[PDB]
Symmetry: D3
Subunit: 94 residues, 6 copies
């Protein structure tokens, strides 16, 4: 019979920067093994965050260039925001 | 044999408001196609956030009125909080 | 045939503390029923957050002691951070 | 993702008649527990057979009135055929 | 997680020949829709058989040229065997 | 969600004996690789049969000592029956 099921892979990426600020942007290659049968959807969020109150909080994350083989885990802050530590969490399911 | 498997659907909803503040609350209808066989559980978080440091950070998100056909993706801030941009991420699995 | 599928369980844990600050750390036992066939991966994030702007925002969450039977849902802030309310979201898939 | 999988149930029904001939026809109610999600296809054959050479061999089997709840396991010989023993085998998959 | 599951398709092919004998051999194209993801294994048997006792009983069946798209359902008797009616049953699973 | 799915393995075993009669009984060890997660059900039938009309047709087949690792594929005729060739077909699903 026809059914809908998903294969899900997930992970975290910790950036401990203090006593230095974290880089304004980061891109990390993530690989799926074995590759997915169909290109999965991927969502990204934050599991840990350390942001300076001296300026507004501006954080961004995304899954870029997603393929059955993997994707690029992306993060960036912008303008005057200062980020001291962060941990990205992500999950990919087809 | 009896096994436990999940069908998962996921997505994001970007609210680019700057140079205006984002609305205090938002509700967006999300549809599952085809509908789930059992009502799924849904969780929501933030993939991007831009909050003014002039006041405390207060952000809320939830999946309301969840059915096999879809749900209402909810967001709201409260009191003096000013949110300039945000991206909700959500995942529904049964 | 050999295929990759996941069983996913998910949930939320709301901590409404205002008018008192939330405890600096929290650990909650989460049980999977029935237990997973293989130990799942678990990721945790925030669905709601209320942080005082008087100090930097420092929030942390993790899934500790993960087994097929469950895990310990962990949260903590640190240093001068004051958290008034928060809701953890988590998802475990094998 | 969309995949094709089957739930299969199977069984046997032994008719030891010797020293008497087996009845010309037999119908046995078979129940599926729990019921199938979609009506399955069912095929029937013989795992054991004892037929007299005094006449031609004529044996028939079928799955009748198939539903998600079960079916009627049918057997019959015809004309001058004499059957002394037989075992039906069947398999139902959706 | 890695699991083993099968998609199974099955069917029957009835040859009512009496009052003429069935052809010594038969080959019928069977199509799978949609095609299998991996080439399946296929087995064939008899659900009904009518063989003359004037000579030995010799019946053969097989699944030939099996692909993800289908296979050739084969039957044949040989030498002096006379077959008056038969029904093939088959099941293909990956 | 809880669903019912099966892993199925199948095979055939050909005994070409002519010009000698096949042994009265045969037992062949069949191995499943990798082993099943739950003990499967197994059914056995005939895909090809060559029986002498000089005596009644008596053929038997069964799956004995079934475990997650395999089973013993069994066949036997009895009394005066003479079998010249046969092919067993079998399918195991959990
Ligand atoms: C968050 O990161 C994503 C990924 O880098 C950014 O997306 C880009 O947005 C620009 C325009 O805003 C587009 O031209 C690019 O094509 C997008 N890239 C991808 C891979 O989608 C996004 O702008 C970032 N958001 C913030 C607030 O920094
Ligand atoms: C976050 O959003 C949810 C959904 O709107 C809010 O939940 C409501 O909470 C009130 C009381 O606090 C209940 O009476 C409603 O029934 C709830 N609605 C639903 C659909 O569950 C929640 O209060 C919001 N949290 C914050 C801090 O704003
Ligand atoms: C977030 O919480 C996790 C879980 O308590 C912390 O992880 C511990 O980190 C220390 C060193 O930093 C290790 O010695 C422990 O073994 C870790 N525990 C576990 C269960 O992994 C983590 O340090 C916390 N992060 C922050 C910024 O507070
Ligand atoms: C084998 O058994 C099936 C099931 O009883 C018989 O099928 C019936 O066939 C007659 C006409 O031949 C139809 O009118 C009925 O509707 C059929 N019943 C069902 C449930 O399909 C079949 O005839 C038998 N074959 C032999 C050779 O005896
Ligand atoms: C049963 O049918 C199969 C399929 O036609 C026959 O298999 C062929 O056997 C010959 C030699 O015996 C081989 O050269 C062919 O390559 C086989 N064909 C295939 C597709 O496998 C088999 O011989 C038949 N058995 C009987 C007793 O008639
Ligand atoms: C068909 O083969 C099976 C398997 O050998 C036979 O089953 C045995 O039957 C006897 C009594 O008839 C029991 O004492 C044994 O325990 C059974 N063995 C198993 C493994 O179940 C069956 O008798 C045979 N049938 C014919 C007609 O020969
Ligand atoms: C150029 C630039 O980054 N501008 C940013 C804008 O994108 C928004 O984040 C705003 C409120 O925090 O702060 C600045 O104006
Ligand atoms: C009425 C109201 O919204 N009150 C809020 C309270 O809910 C909490 O967010 C607190 C700390 O940030 O700020 C205010 O007091
Ligand atoms: C000892 C301690 O907690 N130190 C913290 C450090 O970990 C980091 O959070 C920094 C920036 O916010 O604030 C403090 O220095
Ligand atoms: C009326 C009747 O049953 N006729 C049968 C016919 O169906 C077929 O089986 C034939 C050859 O064996 O034997 C008889 O003629
Ligand atoms: C040439 C030929 O078909 N020979 C057949 C042989 O294959 C076998 O079936 C035997 C016993 O029934 O009958 C004949 O001898
Ligand atoms: C002792 C023995 O094998 N007896 C068999 C009996 O089991 C049954 O097969 C019958 C009809 O064919 O033929 C013989 O009597
Ligand atoms: Cl950490
Ligand atoms: Cl420090
Ligand atoms: Cl996959
Ligand atoms: Cl600022
Ligand atoms: Cl954006
Ligand atoms: Cl700007
Ligand atoms: Cl579904
Ligand atoms: Cl405030
Ligand atoms: Cl709340
Ligand atoms: Cl208040
Ligand atoms: Cl499980
Ligand atoms: Cl501070
Ligand atoms: Cl028996
Ligand atoms: Cl006897
Ligand atoms: Cl089912
Ligand atoms: Cl006759
Ligand atoms: Cl018929
Ligand atoms: Cl007739
Ligand atoms: Cl398929
Ligand atoms: Cl002959
Ligand atoms: Cl052969
Ligand atoms: Cl010969
Ligand atoms: Cl298995
Ligand atoms: Cl005899
Ligand atoms: Na960094
Ligand atoms: Na808005
Ligand atoms: Na608390
Ligand atoms: Na009977
Ligand atoms: Na024919
Ligand atoms: Na033999």
């Amino acid at each position: 019979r026809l059914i809908h099921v998903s294969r899900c892979e997930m992970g975290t990426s910790t950036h401990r920067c203090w006593p230095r600020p974290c880089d304004t942007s980061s891109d990390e290659p993530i690989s799926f093994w074995p590759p997915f049968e169909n290109t999965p959807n991927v969502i990204v969020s934050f599991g840990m965050l350390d942001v300076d109150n001296s300026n507004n909080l501006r954080v961004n994350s995304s899954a870029d260039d997603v393929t059955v083989g993997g994707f690029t885990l992306h993060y960036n802050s912008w303008y005057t925001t200062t980020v001291w530590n962060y941990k990205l969490i992500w999950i990919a399911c087809d």
